Structure 1
Amino acid sequence: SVDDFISTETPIALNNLLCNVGPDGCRAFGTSAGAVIASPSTIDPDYYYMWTRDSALVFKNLIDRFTETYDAGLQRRIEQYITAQVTLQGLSNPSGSLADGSGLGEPKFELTLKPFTGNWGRPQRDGPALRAIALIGYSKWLINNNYQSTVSNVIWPIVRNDLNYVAQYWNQTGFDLWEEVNGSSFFTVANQHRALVEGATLAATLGQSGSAYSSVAPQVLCFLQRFWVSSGGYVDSNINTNEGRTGKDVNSVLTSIHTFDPNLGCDAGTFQPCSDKALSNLKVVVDSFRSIYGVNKGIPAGAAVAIGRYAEDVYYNGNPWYLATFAAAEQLYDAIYVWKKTGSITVTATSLAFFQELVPGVTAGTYSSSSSTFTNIINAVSTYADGFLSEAAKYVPADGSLAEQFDRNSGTPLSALHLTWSYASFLTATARRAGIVPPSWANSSASTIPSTCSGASVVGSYSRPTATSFPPSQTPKPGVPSGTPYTPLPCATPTSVAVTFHELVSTQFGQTVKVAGNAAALGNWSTSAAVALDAVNYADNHPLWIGTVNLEAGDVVEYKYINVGQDGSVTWESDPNHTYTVPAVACVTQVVKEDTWQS
């Protein structure tokens, strides 16, 4: 049963999610405190970086969990994530610097919390919005528990930079959440709108300046309306671009679930999950995958299918994604929640096709909780939503691991292993199924659309946050649900650890980088026995060499990189030797050591 899968997968998903959080997660061990790896995959693909988006989506989930039941272990991680942003905001990077806010649009960073210097689809203007939303989430908790001073001193300067960025740069093109399309993107705009609304509210509570945010927000909402295609009944996910796609993209479904607020009911203006526009869009998006994936062969209309990002996708050949398939279920669980709470379901001309696929012959109208129609709809939609979970479940391996994708024909996992966002997406979908909803972000007025739109923006001011520490033991006030600290799943302690040496060093044609060191596996300082690294991930402006050696757990190793020429001549990097103690920690079987050539 679905219930069986949920009960089994939940502790695995939570464990695997937290394994990807530094400095102590089992697959992110030795990364910076508060860093989140997108995936431990370092080769084909190389996802061993911290993205602003993935990190913020993951921590929003954790903050929501933590808000439901206090967990001092989660609190520790949340605090470290927040303080890591102090370092990141200050960075000058290829998108720009903090001075004019432009640097905040940078999509990804090295896990040492240094800039990523390679070519990339930058900027991505959703990042600051999503980060603000996460930090505002935690701020709400602190305020409710009488720690408002901590918000003002530690969190608000960080949040204020991100909010100023949104208010200044929302009306500018950039890359979408898939990092491919330079334009105006639904997910980005909608989250920018939410960030400004929550920001204005938090500012008012703190007695800080928020009027810029509240005056810009309605204009962002105004622009969001332009993504709707009335003739097709779906959202064109990217506009102001010439990419030549239909625009039918799980982008829009993710948008609905990440800006869900049940207090907004079935508001179509903000694209709520039970809104007629969101329901119509869901059907159009799902339908775009029904006929194209081998895994969907033989599944009838009215039944759940595996879905991907967008039908035109050619990334790894274009496949279903776990997070996309879970997102469809989540939107439906969100819809069911609101229908049950309000005791009423409205079918309109816009959502009719969606409903008739599930309840043949139903017509437009309003059906109350006493009607047989209400019960019929609830059951049909619940079954369909569970169907998306069960479809994804067919392709989850016995160990419960979630990669990024599963093959469109065979269902075998592919691309990045242990994608942090895949685990978050399972956790959120299943929370909504159980009727666990996140804190509200809007009031009724946050849905009122202006008469005429303009690209109104405000030039902001940016300053480096300086506070990098939280007061100890910020426990909940009496009466708040409270529990014991999180403990990871148990494993054996390994005797051997795969150590991936990950070295940035600019080299010229015919040169090879090797690692030499005192351990037998490293060649006991012999240059002939040194371990050659690979240039598989090498680029001139991101000169990465990589390779993996098994070392004895607990061993203290000393090493240096060498550059070996065509002629066999050896160049040692400058002193001192690197000194590394190989971890001997239960569950830590592979680590990445991120080095830069010592000049």
Structure 2
Amino acid sequence: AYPSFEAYSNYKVDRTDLETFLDKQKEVSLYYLLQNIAYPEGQFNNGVPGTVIASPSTSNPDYYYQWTRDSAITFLTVLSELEDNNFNTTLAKAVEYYINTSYNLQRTSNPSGSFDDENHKGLGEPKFNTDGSAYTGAWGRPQNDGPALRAYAISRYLNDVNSLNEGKLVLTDSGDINFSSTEDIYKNIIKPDLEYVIGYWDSTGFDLWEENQGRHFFTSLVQQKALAYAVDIAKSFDDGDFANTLSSTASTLESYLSGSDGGFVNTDVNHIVENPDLLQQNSRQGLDSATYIGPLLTHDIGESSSTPFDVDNEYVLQSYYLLLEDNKDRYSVNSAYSAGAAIGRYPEDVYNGDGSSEGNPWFLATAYAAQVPYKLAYDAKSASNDITINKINYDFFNKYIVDLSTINSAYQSSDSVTIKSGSDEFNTVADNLVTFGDSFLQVILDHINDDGSLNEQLNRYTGYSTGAYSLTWSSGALLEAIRLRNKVKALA
């Protein structure tokens, strides 16, 4: 049951036209995203302001909780909307309420620990109840991606306040808020999460799927990004010694991510191994949609990101191709798709959205899979950068994008093919990347509920929606796909 849910009234998806669907859904999915955020001006005006529910599903399954990860990822979508529009003050108020609630949750003792523990050990706690109290039941704790994604989101709001709102906050003359300046947010809310990541990046915790403990590519990547991005924030508040702590730590984590201690880059299999400890146990072989979701979250197109493992990395793109090819054979629903297809979490998954049997494809994974080729095209065309295709990725490009012997007849004798910006083949490759990305959004249009809401999962046989209803992260993933598609279609 999902008692709180309110459909977008008298809307029904049009399944006959992708273009019309994406134009309309841009508004519809934002309505469903904002419905799950408490803020006085919103639909969810009875919750504690700044609370993000993962889903209105309160049973079968029960996802009516606030997780640090889903709240942060939700607000990266809110931030993109704030950046693209006029620093809309309604949306900015919602971000400041989330910053305030985040301050309170940081200071809430829970089963992971408390704020006064070494390097604020309680900040690894994955989820809290909707009234802001601790979740005391057994859970896969800690999860060390959450404080990194929260630190990145709130850092990014400070950069936008400085650049779009002349350095001013929107909730300054309010008595309900626990900060009165950008420096207060940095010292009191951003720094404590970056201290957590400095203290605990080389420590064991649970992955983003909340299932296994050990080394995880996504977790380390989103930590590296939070630290790197915060360097210039810290400098701006005259926190120079901490800036250089962050710089040094970010470089150290970069080396860990790309070396044999981390174990994620596996040149025996030539793809990323998302969870290397489960490869040692022989329990999973390493393919996971988290391998390309992390790259996408950590390289927003509106930044000039230094951080490693963008989606043009050969081992990330090989994990993406090999998961695609797995899922096209694995899920019967995908028999009528010849390009993109419905994608799940990892090939070994047994979670069926409300128990264990056989895993299913996920709407969020499918929406991120559209973003991979959209970003490859956008990064080339927007900047007039050449496209360089490494030999490990030739099979992917020949099967789905372009025949590489039509570009260079001797390509199999070289280690890479470089397609030059401006050339006719470059325009073909970029348009074919976009059309490939659209094929994943066509899968979503085939199987979305008629009311425009997105569940967590779609059944592997039929494609009918299943699991948690109107999952906030699903809505967000589709909104970011539509955003990237409109940005690259505006260049042609």
TM-score calculated relative to the size of structure 2: 0.84
Match for 1:193 among 224, 230, 240? 224
List aligned pairs for 1:29-178, cutoff 5 A: 29-69=45-85, 70-99=87-116, 100=118, 101-144=120-163, 145-147=165-167, 150-178=181-209
Q: Does the Cα contact within 8 Å between 1:265 and 1:272 map onto a contact in 2?
A: no
Q: Does the Cα contact within 8 Å between 1:250 and 1:324 map onto a contact in 2?
A: yes
1:371, CA displacement in angstroms?
2.6
Match for 1:315 among 336, 351, 358? 351
1:53 and 1:128 map into 2 onto residues whose CA distance is 8
Q: Deviations over 1:309-335 (max 9, x none)?
A: 111111113111110001111121111
2:93 and 2:245 map into 1 onto residues whose CA distance is 33
1:347, CA displacement in angstroms?
1.4
2:24 and 2:54 map into 1 onto residues whose CA distance is 23
Match for 1:353 among 383, 395, 410? 395
The aligned amino acid for 1:198 is Y
1:243, CA displacement in angstroms?
6.3
Number of aligned residue pairs: give it.
434
Matched position secondary structure for 1:17? helix
- Residue number in structure 1 paired with 2:319: 281
1:9, CA displacement in angstroms?
1.2
The aligned amino acid for 2:351 is Y
The aligned amino acid for 2:23 is S
Q: Percent identity?
A: 35
Is 1:416 the counterpart of 2:440 in the alignment?
Answer: no
Q: 1:374 to 1:292 in 2, by over 3 A?
A: same
List aligned pairs for 1:14-25, cutoff 5 A: 14-24=30-40
2:41 and 2:460 map into 1 onto residues whose CA distance is 31
- Residue number in structure 1 paired with 2:452: 400
Is 1:252 the counterpart of 2:291 in the alignment?
Answer: yes
The aligned amino acid for 2:155 is I
The aligned amino acid for 2:289 is V
Q: Deviations over 1:244-285 (max 9, x none)?
A: 111100010101111115599898x71112233332221112
1:423, CA displacement in angstroms?
0.4
- Residue number in structure 1 paired with 2:386: 344
Matched position secondary structure for 1:366? strand
The aligned amino acid for 2:291 is S
Matched position secondary structure for 2:309? coil
List aligned pairs for 1:2-21, cutoff 5 A: 2-21=18-37
1:77 and 1:65 map into 2 onto residues whose CA distance is 12
Is 1:432 the counterpart of 2:484 in the alignment?
Answer: yes
The aligned amino acid for 1:74 is L
Matched position secondary structure for 1:347? strand
2:305 and 2:439 map into 1 onto residues whose CA distance is 23
Determine which structure has more spread, i.e. the larger CA radius of gyration. Answer: 1
The aligned amino acid for 2:197 is V
1:346 and 1:130 map into 2 onto residues whose CA distance is 30
List aligned pairs for 1:147-546, cutoff 5 A: 147=167, 150-208=181-239, 209-225=242-258, 226-241=263-278, 242=281, 244-261=283-300, 270-300=308-338, 303-316=339-352, 317-340=358-381, 341-357=383-399, 358-362=401-405, 363=411, 364-435=416-487
2:267 and 2:58 map into 1 onto residues whose CA distance is 43
Q: Deviations over 1:416-444 (max 9, x none)?
A: 0010000000111111111289xxxxxxx
1:197 and 1:333 map into 2 onto residues whose CA distance is 25
2:286 and 2:145 map into 1 onto residues whose CA distance is 18
Q: Deviations over 1:70-89 (max 9, x none)?
A: 21110111110000011100
1:25 and 1:230 map into 2 onto residues whose CA distance is 52
1:26, CA displacement in angstroms?
6.9
Q: 1:12 to 1:432 in 2, by over 3 A?
A: same
Structure 1: 5+ residue runs without aligned partners? Answer: 438-599
1:342 and 1:280 map into 2 onto residues whose CA distance is 24
The aligned amino acid for 1:238 is N
List aligned pairs for 1:574-593, cutoff 5 A: none
2:223 and 2:483 map into 1 onto residues whose CA distance is 24
> Which is richer in strand?
1
Q: Deviations over 1:116-173 (max 9, x none)?
A: 0000000000000000001001000122233278210234310000000001100011
1:379, CA displacement in angstroms?
2.2
TM-score calculated relative to the size of structure 1: 0.70
Q: Does the Cα contact within 8 Å between 1:52 and 1:107 map onto a contact in 2?
A: yes
2:23 and 2:80 map into 1 onto residues whose CA distance is 20
1:361 and 1:417 map into 2 onto residues whose CA distance is 43
- Residue number in structure 2 paired with 1:569: none
Matched position secondary structure for 2:391? coil
The aligned amino acid for 2:273 is D
The aligned amino acid for 2:257 is L
Matched position secondary structure for 1:394? helix
